[PDB]
Design a protein around this ligand. Sequence first.
Ligand SMILES: Nc1nc2c(ncn2[C@@H]2O[C@H](COP(=O)(O)OP(=O)(O)O)[C@@H](O)[C@H]2O)c(=O)[nH]1
Ligand SMILES: [Mn+2]
Ligand SMILES: [Zn+2]
Length: 595
Amino acid sequence: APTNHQGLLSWVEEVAELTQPDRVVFTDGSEEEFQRLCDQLVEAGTFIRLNPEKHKNSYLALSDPSDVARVESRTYICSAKEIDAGPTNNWMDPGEMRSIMKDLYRGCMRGRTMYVVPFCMGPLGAEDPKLGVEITDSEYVVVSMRTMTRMGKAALEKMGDDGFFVKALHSVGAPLEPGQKDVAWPCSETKYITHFPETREIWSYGSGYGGNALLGKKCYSLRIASAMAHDEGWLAEHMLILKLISPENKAYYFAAAFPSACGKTNLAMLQPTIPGWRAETLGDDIAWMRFGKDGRLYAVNPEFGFFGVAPGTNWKSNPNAMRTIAAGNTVFTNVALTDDGDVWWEGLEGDPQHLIDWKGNDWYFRETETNAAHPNSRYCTPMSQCPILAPEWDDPQGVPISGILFGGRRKTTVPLVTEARDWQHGVFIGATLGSEQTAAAEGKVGNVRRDPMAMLPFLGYNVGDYFQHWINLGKHADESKLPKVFFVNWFRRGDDGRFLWPGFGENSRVLKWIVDRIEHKAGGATTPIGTVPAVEDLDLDGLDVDAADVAAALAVDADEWRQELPLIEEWLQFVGEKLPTGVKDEFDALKERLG
Ligand SMILES: Nc1nc2c(ncn2[C@@H]2O[C@H](COP(=O)(O)OP(=O)(O)O)[C@@H](O)[C@H]2O)c(=O)[nH]1
Ligand SMILES: [Mn+2]
Ligand SMILES: [Zn+2]
């Protein structure tokens, strides 16, 4: 082993004695190692190599269809006390959990190689690099971790001899007995994704898929990290980071939290529609925000790659995503395969009459009743291949945030854009973020789900304490230096069910109002829920849209808002005993202004 970190070595020994793998392998993150792992993945049938002419060094992997299921009920925050997980989290006593998972882990890696994968979340040049080591028996995980994090030799050296690091244990939970033939995608029917916040540990078992197995993606970046940030005085958030550049060439940085399927990728890849405006991205999922010497809040993307949703993506919908993929070095999971060895998914241009679907079965145009690609299939691709990546993406100091945006899907009630009255009000609007989405295993059609700061399934501690944490950071900061907070809604619909606002690139007009507000040069009316622009405060020059529709999108109707109040109240009761008085005070204030 290429290290003298004895704490690390002891942990590897202890784990290997439990899981009993055939051998242990430390990964260094080199290109020859990568090519070697891929070659082995092709041999196992886990990867198929894509036609080099269309894709350089790119692969397709098809998972076991039972391993793509949503696993929120199998995801746990195992703090010592239940109150410290809170009502948004699944809790189990830590001792009870360990006894369950130790039973599962004992002998689990029999007949398999056990990889030890060191990695860095965020740029290496940082002063306190957040380091982790993932142990996994999945080669697929190793390859994808290489793309999604700064993996290997550099992070291992940054660990020194006694540097702290997050212990991330993973197993697919499919031991092989000496005779046994493996399968392309091993996994178990028993799945746990468990987090021990006080010790900063992640124990995953039974799934080899996505955020369950690539332990930097959500487990580290939000769950464990939010707990760290809680204790250390910063923010680990589900936010894209956008760099907006004015015609006068001034850069404004925004962090925006939207729940999944509410537009984070599209805003991150914004192509402004107002002449002279440009946009670049630093990330579309996770933001780590820390106060600098400036007194300003600086954001860094702790990830190194994109794990984007394939279906829906095309040269019209997202040319920048397509260009990122075209450069190669990409792993597609659960998409379809064309007759000429290209990949395809619903929404991608082309009209393939026959495909091989994501289960290896023949698929036929206007015949086969199932999607060719899984509806939440993924591509995993390097960030550095993104043509609109901002040059400061690998800057350990991060970028100063001028604005924080919250938003979700609301057919009614919530205006296109609102500015918060002040920081505490901003925390309130984040805290009560609603979105008209639901899932199978939940049902509840028509429901308004509250997804606080877009963090409902990602908080590593009590949601009330989290709100208090947000409150405290602002309370103790230079008020003038804090980002302004904004609430947006792209999804308001008219009486006919049309979108009142066209959105996508035209959202650059909303961001322009936001910039203008930052620069103290735009108007906005005081309403009960905040400052909302009139239609003439927005730049609609060049936009073929009905002024009356824009006015409706911006409307704050006191009745709609009064009907909204009992929804907010029952959410705030659900938050429970740790609901901060600051959030309570803001609800009362809102109620008073609505009268
Ligand atoms: N009407 C409308 N739809 C949008 C807008 N932005 C994104 N969407 C749609 O919302 C869905 C999810 O968008 P995406 O950017 O992938 O969301 P993400 O999962 O949060 O990254 C897609 O079907 C988009 O077409 C918008 O500004 N207006
Ligand atoms: Mn996305
Ligand atoms: Zn996400």
